[PDB]
Design a protein around this ligand. Structure first.
Ligand SMILES: CC(=O)N1CCN(c2ccc(CN(C3CCC3)S(=O)(=O)c3ccccc3)c(F)c2)CC1
Lengths: 11, 246
């Protein structure tokens, strides 16, 4: 998978 | 920042942010130094498949990176940057911070690193098939060990490793330049007050950390080529986003 950072930052 | 009060507020803010995201406490890491892998266990680690050993290391690295993300999230000034730049900084910086963070879990007296509940040497990672990368990292940790970093110093240096204005892809370079400067002012102020400015000339270059991250990616691409299904099936998503670049 990918685009994990975005999810981690928005939380 | 136009006063010592403000800069000293930044110092403490950054230290506090590191404390709340250090993953493993310094006390805990020191209290486990006599807990070293036996030769039976070492031989067991060496007899593990290359792909499982890569998988375990990838999992632990990714776990470590999550705490670097949270450090960054709690870092004064970082969340006010646009997320594009937050992602540019973390893509290029996360691994580096972890490499610097790793010297706390490294024992210079016997040359062992804390890994899966015990301390082990370079030979513990022989199954990976990337001897140079391992030696380099162990040497990198060994030379940081020689500086006897305090927790405060670690925090400020890692903040500066993360907040680097010269990363390609930054849309707000000037904003990142300003943050860096303030963190640099804080770091140097702390070192001045604490009579520790001598370590400045002993910090390794920006090129050294980059050389270590470059190597990590090289070796992954070689492993990726041999076990592409394991990378897809068995590696952490965040690891692949940061390093696999497919
Ligand atoms: C915060 C803290 O103190 N810790 C303890 C050390 N911990 C750790 C991380 C990665 C590796 C694995 N890697 C290095 C260690 C020598 C090999 S690595 O991620 O750089 C790597 C992964 C895959 C291939 C080669 C190296 C490892 F063993 C431990 C991170 C968390």
């Amino acid at each position: 998978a990918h685009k994990i950072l975005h999810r981690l930052l928005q939380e | 920042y136009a006063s010592l009060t403000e800069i000293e507020h930044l110092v403490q803010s950054v230290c506090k942010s590191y404390r709340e995201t250090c993953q493993l406490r310094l006390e805990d890491l020191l209290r486990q130094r006599s807990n070293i892998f036996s030769r039976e266990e070492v031989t067991g680690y060496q007899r593990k498949s290359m792909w499982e050993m890569w998988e375990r290391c990838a999992h632990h690295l990714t776990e470590a990176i999550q705490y670097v993300v949270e450090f960054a999230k709690r870092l004064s000034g970082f969340m006010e940057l646009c997320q594009n730049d937050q992602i540019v900084l973390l893509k290029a910086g996360a691994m580096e911070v972890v490499l610097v963070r790793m010297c706390r879990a490294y024992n210079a007296d016997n040359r062992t690193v804390f890994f899966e509940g015990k301390y082990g040497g370079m030979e513990l990672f022989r199954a990976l098939g990337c001897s140079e990368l391992i030696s380099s990292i162990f040497d990198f940790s060994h030379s940081l060990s020689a500086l006897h970093f305090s927790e405060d110093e670690i925090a400020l240096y890692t903040a500066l490793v993360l907040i680097n204005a010269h990363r390609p892809g930054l849309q707000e370079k000037r904003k990142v330049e300003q943050l860096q400067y303030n963190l640099e002012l804080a770091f140097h102020h702390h070192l001045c007050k604490t009579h520790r400015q001598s370590i400045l000339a002993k910090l390794p270059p920006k090129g050294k950390l980059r050389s270590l991250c470059s190597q990590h990616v090289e070796r992954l691409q070689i492993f990726q080529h041999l076990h592409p299904i394991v990378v897809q099936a068995a590696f952490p998503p965040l690891y692949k986003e940061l390093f696999s670049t497919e």
